[PDB]
Amino acid sequence: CFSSWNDGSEGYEWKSRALSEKRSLALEFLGNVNKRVSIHDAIRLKADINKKAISNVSCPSFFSGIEGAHLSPSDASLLKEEFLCDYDPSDTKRMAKWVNLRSETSDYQSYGAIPEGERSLWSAWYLRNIKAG
Amino acid sequence: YLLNKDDVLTRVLEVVKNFEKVDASKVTPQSHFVNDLGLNSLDVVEVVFAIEQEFILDIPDHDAEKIQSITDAVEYISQNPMAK
Amino acid sequence: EKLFQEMILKKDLSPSRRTYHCMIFMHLSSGEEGGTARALRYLEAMERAGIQVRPSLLKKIVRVNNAAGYKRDMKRRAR
Amino acid sequence: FVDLETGTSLYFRDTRDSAEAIAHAADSKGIKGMDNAIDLYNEYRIVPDLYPEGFQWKHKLNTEYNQWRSNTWLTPDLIPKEHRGRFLCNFQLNIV
Amino acid sequence: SLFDPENVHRLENAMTHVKQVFADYVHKKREGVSTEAERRMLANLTAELNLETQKHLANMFKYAEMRLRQVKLEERHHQLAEIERLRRMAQQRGGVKGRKGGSRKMSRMERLKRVINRAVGLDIAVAETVLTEMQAQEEFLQFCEVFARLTLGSGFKHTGKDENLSAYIESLRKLYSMDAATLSTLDVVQYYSSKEGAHPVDWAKRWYERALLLPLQSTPEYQKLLQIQQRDESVARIKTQKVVNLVEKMFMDPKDKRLESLHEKRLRYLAHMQMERQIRCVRENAKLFDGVENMPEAAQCRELYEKIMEKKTAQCNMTSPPERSIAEELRALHQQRKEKMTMRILGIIENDVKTEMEWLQNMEEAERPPLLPIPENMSYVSAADVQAWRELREDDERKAANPFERRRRTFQPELLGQAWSVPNKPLLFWGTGVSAVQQALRHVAEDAERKRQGLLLAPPYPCAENPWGWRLAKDILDDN
Amino acid sequence: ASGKDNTMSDDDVIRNIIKERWKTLEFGDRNAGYPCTFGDYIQFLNEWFKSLDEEGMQRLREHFDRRIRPLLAVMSPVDILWLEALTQNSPHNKEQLQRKIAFQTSLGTPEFFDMSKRLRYEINEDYKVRDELGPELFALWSKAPERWPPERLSKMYGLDFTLVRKILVWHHFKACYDACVEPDWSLPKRLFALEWIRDVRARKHGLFYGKMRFAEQKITFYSDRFLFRDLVNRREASYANVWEMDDPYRFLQTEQDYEDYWGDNYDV
Amino acid sequence: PKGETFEEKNEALRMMGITSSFQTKDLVPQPDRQKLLPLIRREEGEIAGSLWAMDGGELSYPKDGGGPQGWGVRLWRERQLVKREYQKVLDGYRPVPQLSTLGNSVRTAGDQLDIERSGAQTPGELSDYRNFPDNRFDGGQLKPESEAAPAVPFSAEL
Amino acid sequence: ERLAWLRDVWAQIDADYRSGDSARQETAAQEISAALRGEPNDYMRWVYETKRELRFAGPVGRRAIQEELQAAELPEVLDEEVNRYHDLKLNMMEIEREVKAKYGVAGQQHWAELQAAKDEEYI
């Protein structure tokens, strides 16, 4: 909820899940030998089926999508921006900082990011992006 | 339709020549397997299985008894029309 | 050589050390017969006119002659 | 398993402490200590620290990942203040 | 207020929670097991994020600098479009006044329209013209989409043979150099920055004309509607007392000889934005409406295939011939903008968790065993293959002779070190194996004397006599 | 799947199915669904290496150097143990290796494994210098050596002087050894003549030797201008490299004198 | 004499009945450009060994017994030299190496799927494939570099 | 050149410290207190991170970063500064305090599991 988004021991039922998924992804990328297999015909087909299976999933929209049919400077700015600017390329990239695209995947997808000194199972390298604020 | 007998003879000449028991010099276009080439009767059954792999058609068991030489072997394959 | 003797004889200009080095290394780098004998004439003209003869010039003369030995051998084998 | 640039000796003297250096390298190696080189003259090696002052980050330490391991006696206050962070060359110790 | 830069540490925690909620929802949606509770949790989180975004709209209008820059750019573009529309309307009104002075009703209508535009604080004529342009562009795109769906049975596939960015730039340069007959890069980028919202149509028109092989500038009516839409759319002491803006003095003049490369890069950026908007809208038309092309009726496909055959026959014939209520609606518009903003947020989070679940499942997809090969007939080289590949074998021998043609042989397989050659004899199965049976007869005679005498082999367990433990495979048919 | 391989030739589908069938090879029981065992593969390797000649062993070592040697130079020995556990395919051996933390943590990273591509490219580049440019250099030197000397080939191809001469010697000796012909021993005496006189010495067993920096204790030619002019005039009147076709070797008018001079008595 | 240039060389080889594989100097292997291979040849030794082998005895390979002359120490020192070169790669002194088959086969299978669907040669192309999802084609194929244009700020007009 | 760039930076801090606004003088006092205590700036960390990102990106991303930051007054930073920043080991105590502040008792359980893995790898 709104109160469960701040820090300080609130929202424990999902904070422990996110800290377990950060741990299980680090142990699977480092300590699981059976993941370093070159891909074959079964992996190329069934992940392509898994590629289409996630794309067939449609998000359930809320009731917000339903509709029916001397001004101030702040009120006229919203009406002028909606009619003259239907597509804004500057605003869709401001959302990319908030959503933080490839949050838990780009830490293992980047080139030369992980040092060899923190390539152990006890190492704490997936918690460097944690900011208390 | 039917393959000519010159090509079927040259096909079956190379099949018998690759057998390990017989020699490549003693095989003639008119020859017998047991008498001339010196083969056991189990190897004569092994001869017709090589013809079943060279020519992909299935030779029946009654027609396999009727072939005992190379002159009837090239004649029987030339009679069969399902060969490609 | 035409511009060199037109500078020396007509315009009475004293050539510098660099343009003497250029006429030395041009005859040294050319594989024709007598280029060394003309580069030594330019060396004599540097010596008797007060132009400085540096040791780097001598080492570069030896190095450029040993490098242009290939061009000399090509022009000798072509005959 | 020597390094030919940093792991060799300057002097001719055989101090005959090679087995002690091999035992100390076996005690100092861990999960990744088998990968790096072995220095038989590491007990006499003095590598000067080139970073006495700089940016001191809060989230990061003052040492680096690829750091040469110190000795049992080697402390950073041996080099004095006027020579600290100045020597670009590693030194080797010889006892008179 | 959440989207301010002060509560970003709360924001990433909220995004993490929404990501966990969507990761449960997509998982229970692809498995089909009680997705109603995940939908209710997502609705509660969407309501909380909608309240946070309703506060954060004002919080980012007051705090965020990029929102203020986008608002200033949108206001400048709207003022430029309103100035162009007002100049065109003033020219039309001056022509109507010079043609006839008795225009009192037209002057009253123009005054009423100006009063309505001043009350609405926007130019209604330019907005209605842009809406008509978007409507005709959408109708043309839907017509071309159903035409490419029914005629050839295909959709939109962006390939490498399409019109690239540089050719699009040169084509726009040739178009506007035929329009104004003398131009520079500065006027082109000024016109493209002044338009700034017009949906371009020429790149998709060329991409459909390369697929249909028919001219589209005169044959449909939507193209002529877009064309007529583009036709009707297109002292000293006082300045000394006027204060000079120091911010304008820090920028160079637009007619400067150091700014040509920046104008070229801006032209490349604007053409890339136009091509990207065309690719996005045609991909949206192929995503929402081309899914019905696979489920289309047989009559609409067959009659259009007959029409495509008739068009091919016509092309062959052409080749033969050649040879109290304002505030309520304002609150409704503000709520619509807020819910559009939070749905644009939720769609990006949905695509984020889609890519995250794809990359997380692609790790687990590696550990599964591969497929089983189907049983094929046995590998056999017949004598017809030997007699057919004889001349190629001789040519491969001649090419293996010389070093310059050694690697240019047509048949070169390779094992570890050796290169395979063309076989000169048929490789058969039934003729071989006559020595192994004799060796097995001698071995089974020796084994029978062994079992009658009671002898053991070399120790099959890895003892000191043989460090590699060499064990014969104990066969059930060879049990004794 | 249609979208990945829309249009490709027959050799492309042959290479693709060959790659996919090379990927799916495992070593288990012959009746359990696997094609062969590990020991059958070891027997195939042993009796395949037994049937090789010297040229076959040479091609085997060249295939080792081109492909397997950079991968062995990059990979850790724990990666070699992991690959051996993948060969033997025993679940007990794999699960006994999987409990060790040092086995799991010390596996190599692909960012370090990408150096094997550049090392493989450099080794295949040296083998392309040898096997591809080699016959062209040999043809250009063997048709007209006075038109294309080794220094001209070394300048116009930019490889090296000694590398070009070693390529020529290796190509002639490789053509002689593969045809069961005794090689022409005079060719290293003809391409490395100064090197044969300078370097090739008889060496005894239990002692170490040195090398003379100069042949004579002399005065330098930089000490006087006249000695310098004499050296420059003598280097003008000298070759840079002398071969069998030049004017000092023009007295060899008969091929019998050619074989007598360049064969077995060149040191005399 | 003629034959120094490549046109005269190719014409002379045409008169000799030889079509040369190297028409110009762009198709020259140029062993002076090598950086890792002379570094390996200087310190440890010849990594090939069987490059110059007449009859099978001029090959330089480590011994079969082991110890300091065996294969393990030689492969360890070669791996240390390649580690020095990779440390030079990480510090920006050397260019980024392309994707190897050994490197691709050890990666996460999702990265292998993205590489085989994108056709990326360098990992920088894979980073451009991931950080710009609107750049690729409809078959997942990577677009060339010239088809992307970044936003030019007005603050460069100061 | 770096001292000239630092003068150009601190001219803005001196302008905000003498402006008269409460927020500008407060942020300028925060910058002065962060500089006097020896604390390094976040801008240098961001510059090092974006320089390493510019180093390890492909040509589209490299052109995008170079076109975004061509007008932004970035200091000329050598690669050795980025290598000095990147190769520093991270502090365990600061990450521990950050995981106890950001997460609550779940952070305590996660740090207990991390110390369990540490003393497991010790054995």
Automatic annotation (TrEMBL), chain B:
<keyword id="KW-0597">Phosphoprotein</keyword>
<keyword id="KW-0276">Fatty acid metabolism</keyword>
<keyword id="KW-0444">Lipid biosynthesis</keyword>
<dbReference type="GO" id="GO:0005759">
    <property type="term" value="C:mitochondrial matrix"/>
</dbReference>
<keyword id="KW-0443">Lipid metabolism</keyword>
<keyword id="KW-0596">Phosphopantetheine</keyword>
<comment type="function">
    <text>Carrier of the growing fatty acid chain in fatty acid biosynthesis.</text>
</comment>
<dbReference type="GO" id="GO:0005739">
    <property type="term" value="C:mitochondrion"/>
</dbReference>
<feature type="domain" description="Carrier">
    <location>
        <begin position="6"/>
        <end position="81"/>
    </location>
</feature>
<dbReference type="GO" id="GO:0000036">
    <property type="term" value="F:acyl carrier activity"/>
</dbReference>
<keyword id="KW-0275">Fatty acid biosynthesis</keyword>
<dbReference type="GO" id="GO:0000035">
    <property type="term" value="F:acyl binding"/>
</dbReference>
<keyword id="KW-0813">Transport</keyword>
<keyword id="KW-0809">Transit peptide</keyword>
<keyword id="KW-0249">Electron transport</keyword>
<comment type="similarity">
    <text>Belongs to the acyl carrier protein (ACP) family.</text>
</comment>
<dbReference type="GO" id="GO:0006633">
    <property type="term" value="P:fatty acid biosynthetic process"/>
</dbReference>
<protein>
    <recommendedName>
        <fullName>Acyl carrier protein</fullName>
    </recommendedName>
</protein>
<keyword id="KW-0496">Mitochondrion</keyword>
Automatic annotation (TrEMBL), chain F:
<protein>
    <submittedName>
        <fullName>Uncharacterized protein</fullName>
    </submittedName>
</protein>
